[PDB]
Ligand binder design. Structure first.
Ligand SMILES: CC/C(=C(\c1ccc(O)cc1)c1ccc(OCCN(C)C)cc1)c1ccccc1
Ligand SMILES: CC/C(=C(\c1ccc(O)cc1)c1ccc(OCCN(C)C)cc1)c1ccccc1
Lengths: 222, 222
């Protein structure tokens, strides 16, 4: 069994409850608040998680920040996708916050949650395993295509190392499909597309708040 | 040598000149007109090209249209990227229409053309070959993630067939890097991201015109 995959499995953060405020009337604002508060907590643990990825900490702080800046929404989305694989037309943002179509409509997230469900659909068909999920999260971080990378070569080595882990996993676990690793890689474009739209929506409705995201990753990394 | 790759090479369309109107004063409008007129001509030949891809014609007309609808901007962009690999900070839209930074600024395309140059940068480092380019164009078509596919399984078989061709090519041509096929696949997210932004920009400034894109692919396919 592949050691990087094993390591990523033990580095996996614990479940986080959303705790929607039971005193607040249901509304689009309440849904967005709940999601913002959930994501902020998730981002803190994502930063800690990334430090476990072999080679990530040896990048400059600027490069670590750049990768995180570019990847954070993909990592959040891949999480909700994975959590939702055993459900039907619903998204498990947390065990206590499962969004059906009516809820998504109410939150103004129909189009976005429908795209996320498209990711779910594909991964259900492919029978996405936890091992594959955690490896793809790490790959999405390393492959996030920041336009501000200092050490392009080191970031490529990190991509290489993680891709190798996925290939080695699939070679051992899935001999019935010698192309499964590539199929997994071919799911990344839809994740990127969905993230891109989610981030556009995030800025369009001003969820970023008073303090820029750049400084937030700084505080947490420094 | 891989037959699908060989076939794709012979299916490659001839060069198309942009023919910017020499009587028209240079302006953002002239640049956008030139690009619109270039793309429209390219789209006609792209539709003919897709018919050469093994299995594409045996899909329903609806599925052919769906793949084209979802992929067309990626295919256009991958073309300009490939045409630009031997240039520096300039995009070869056509032999007679090469956009430098000043031109992009003037056209309102700085951000978009900069993203396209990011694609170029990565492919230069990877030493992207024509064989790899034409194969990735076909993969981008098949992997374009339309939300309206009728025969999900047939579209997967098409993805499979093209992925197999890339893997077989790389296995024979690039034994020094057993992971090169996966590296090529890992370039697709940035293409998707760039296309997504280009399409958003395309609709934001109303370049679609009086007739919807759906009917355009119909006419040309029927
Ligand atoms: C898709 C749901 C979502 C977020 C989300 C996704 C996955 C997940 O596990 C948790 C949340 C989302 C919402 C807000 C957000 O902002 C965090 C920044 N702070 C400073 C508010 C990030 C993601 C969202 C994204 C954009 C607009 C509206 C909602
Ligand atoms: C990135 C350049 C570009 C186009 C382009 C890209 C590659 C290429 O080889 C040729 C052109 C572009 C521009 C217009 C366009 O519309 C075609 C639809 N008709 C009906 C006008 C498609 C692509 C463009 C895209 C969006 C907004 C503005 C410009």
């Amino acid at each position: 069994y592949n050691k990087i995959v094993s390591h990523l499995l033990v580095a996996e953060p614990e479940k986080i409850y959303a705790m929607p405020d039971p005193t607040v009337p249901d509304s689009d604002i309440k849904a967005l608040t709940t999601l913002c508060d959930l994501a902020d907590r998730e981002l803190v643990v994502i930063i800690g998680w990334a430090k476990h990825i072999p080679g990530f900490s040896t990048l400059s702080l600027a490069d670590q920040m750049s990768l995180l800046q570019s990847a954070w929404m993909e990592i959040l989305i891949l999480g909700v996708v994975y959590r939702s694989l055993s459900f039907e037309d619903e998204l498990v943002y947390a065990d206590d916050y499962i969004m059906d179509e009516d809820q998504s409509k109410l939150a103004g997230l129909l189009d976005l949650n429908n795209a996320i469900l498209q990711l779910v659909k594909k991964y259900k068909s492919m029978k996405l395993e936890k091992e594959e999920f955690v490896t793809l999260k790490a790959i999405a971080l390393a492959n996030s295509d920041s336009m501000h990378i200092e050490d392009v070569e080191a970031v490529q080595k990190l991509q290489d190392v993680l891709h190798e882990a996925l290939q080695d996993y699939e070679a051992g676990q899935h001999m019935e499909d010698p192309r499964r690793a590539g199929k997994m890689l071919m799911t990344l474009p839809l994740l990127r597309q969905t993230s891109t739209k989610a981030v556009q929506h995030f800025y369009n409705i001003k969820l970023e708040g008073k303090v820029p995201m750049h400084k937030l990753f700084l505080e947490m990394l420094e």
